[PDB]
């Protein structure tokens, strides 16, 4: 087993002050721009937003979301029934406006286009800025204009595909679980993140447990497994996961399946590998060996 004080150290949160100033910096850049078709909202997502950052110097995940228009899953007839009209302002236009705003503020050398994000070197931390449009997921019987689930969506030009995320729901649901576990959920995420990273530093696979997938995996664990001590939490969580049916796990946003064939999803075999390494870490810590 792993000593409690070691697990408790692994549960510590990295500083967030520099990350908040990174967020405030991006927001100030966009506040200075003259927006032709709606001013986007700017919020954080990722570990800093969810209080699961294990360092204070990791990249800041920023969402820049246009809400004056929305993409959706409606058919043309359903859009008509709701009185929606086509926006002539596209995701591409909005992206170009966001990029111009950031470039005007930080300088061209500090703003560059990534695969899925605009990457910005601020005077604080690097920011990964997701430029997205509000997404409305309507139910299969589409009857009322207000009955939808809100996410966001963005285009990936190098892959000719659209991504739909639900970061606000990811945050809301993680906070709710943290409330209901008497605040053990987020420290437990960080404990496992630091345990994973400790193993990666010693030579374990780089993709042993990508942070987002690890949060989603732990989100599916019953609240009763979190609490008491970190030692009891480590074992109760891991022992439950070893016996669980992973196939029906949902992401923390409550909408998507965690495991599947799409590029946003994980695989059960990778999840099982993570559990094996945590098992070995636990049983391996206090044990002596010798050559056979």
Ligand X SMILES: Nc1ncnc2c1ncn2[C@@H]1O[C@H](COP(=O)(O)CP(=O)(O)OP(=O)(O)O)[C@@H](O)[C@H]1O
Ligand Y SMILES: O=c1ccn([C@@H]2O[C@H](COP(=O)(O)NP(=O)(O)OP(=O)(O)O)[C@@H](O)[C@H]2O)c(=O)[nH]1
Question: Residues 6 or more apart from 120 whose CB is under 8 A from it?
Answer: 26, 102, 106, 110, 111, 126, 127, 129
Give the CA angle between residues 33, 37, 40 to the nearest 5°: 60
Q: Which of 36, 107, 114, 157 binds ligand Y (CB under 6 A)?
A: 114
Nearer to Mg ion, 46 or 174 (CB): 46
Nearer to ligand X, 44 or 69 (CB): 44
In the complex, the residues that contact Mg ion under the rule CB under 5 A are 46-47, 61
* 8 A C-beta contact, residue 234 and residue 279: no
Binding residue ranges for UTP: 45, 61, 115-119, 165
Is residue 115 near ligand Y by the rule CB under 6 A?
yes
Please choose which of Mg ion, ligand X, ligand Y, none residue 225 contacts, taking the beta carbon within 5 to 8 angstroms, the exact cut-off set by kind. none
Give the CA angle between residues 49, 273, 60 to the nearest 5°: 20
Is residue 206 near ligand Y by the rule CB under 6 A?
no
Helices (H), the chain: 4-10, 17-31, 46-50, 76-81, 91-106, 167-180, 185-201, 211-219, 230-243, 268-284
- Chain-centroid distance of CA 223 in Å reads 20
Segment interacting with ligand Y, rule: CB under 6 A, options 75-83, 92-100, 115-123, 194-202: 115-123
Cβ at position 47, least distance to ligand X in Å: 3
* 8 A C-beta contact, residue 155 and residue 91: yes
Q: Which of 232, 264, 268, 279 binds ligand Y (CB under 6 A)?
A: 264
Q: Is 48 helix (H, G, I), strand (E, B) or coil?
A: helix
Is residue 257 near ligand Y by the rule CB under 6 A?
no
Please choose which of ligand X, ligand Y, Mg ion, none residue 53 contacts, taking the beta carbon within 5 to 8 angstroms, the exact cut-off set by kind. ligand X
Is residue 256 near ligand Y by the rule CB under 6 A?
no
Please choose which of Mg ion, ligand Y, ligand X, none residue 114 contacts, taking the beta carbon within 5 to 8 angstroms, the exact cut-off set by kind. ligand Y
Cβ at position 125, least distance to ligand X in Å: 11
Cβ at position 90, least distance to ligand X in Å: 22
Question: Residues 6 or more apart from 131 whose CB is under 8 A from it?
Answer: 64, 91, 94, 95, 98, 99, 117, 118, 154
Please choose which of ligand X, Mg ion, ligand Y, none residue 232 contacts, taking the beta carbon within 5 to 8 angstroms, the exact cut-off set by kind. none
């Amino acid at each position: 087993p792993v000593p409690e004080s070691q697990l408790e150290r692994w549960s510590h949160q990295g500083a967030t002050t520099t990350a908040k100033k990174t967020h405030e910096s991006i927001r100030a850049a966009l506040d200075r721009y003259k927006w032709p078709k709606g001013k986007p909202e700017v919020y954080l997502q990722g570990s800093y937003k969810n209080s699961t950052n294990i360092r204070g110097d990791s990249d800041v995940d920023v969402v820049v979301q246009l809400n004056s228009v929305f993409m959706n899953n409606l058919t043309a007839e359903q859009k008509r029934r709701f009185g929606f009209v086509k926006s002539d302002y596209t995701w591409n236009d909005f992206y170009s406006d966001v990029e111009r705003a950031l470039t005007d503020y930080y300088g061209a050398s500090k703003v560059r286009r990534g695969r899925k994000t605009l990457k910005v070197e601020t005077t604080y931390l690097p920011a990964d800025v997701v430029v997205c449009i509000q997404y409305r997921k309507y139910p299969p019987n589409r009857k009322s204009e207000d009955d939808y689930i809100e996410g966001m969506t963005f285009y990936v030009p190098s892959e000719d595909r659209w991504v739909v995320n639900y970061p606000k729901l990811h945050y809301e649901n993680g906070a709710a679980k943290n409330q209901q576990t008497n605040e053990w959920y987020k420290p437990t995420i960080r404990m496992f993140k630091n345990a994973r990273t400790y193993l990666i530093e010693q030579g374990a696979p780089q993709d042993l447990a990508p942070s987002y997938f690890l949060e989603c995996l732990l989100y599916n664990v019953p609240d009763s497994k979190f609490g008491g001590t970190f030692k009891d939490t480590f074992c109760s969580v891991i022992n439950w996961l070893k016996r669980a049916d992973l196939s029906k796990f949902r992401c923390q946003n409550g909408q998507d399946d965690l495991f599947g064939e799409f590029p946003e999803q994980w695989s059960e075999e990778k999840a099982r590998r993570f559990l094996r390494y945590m098992d070995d870490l636990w049983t391996g810590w206090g044990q002596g060996s010798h050559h056979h």
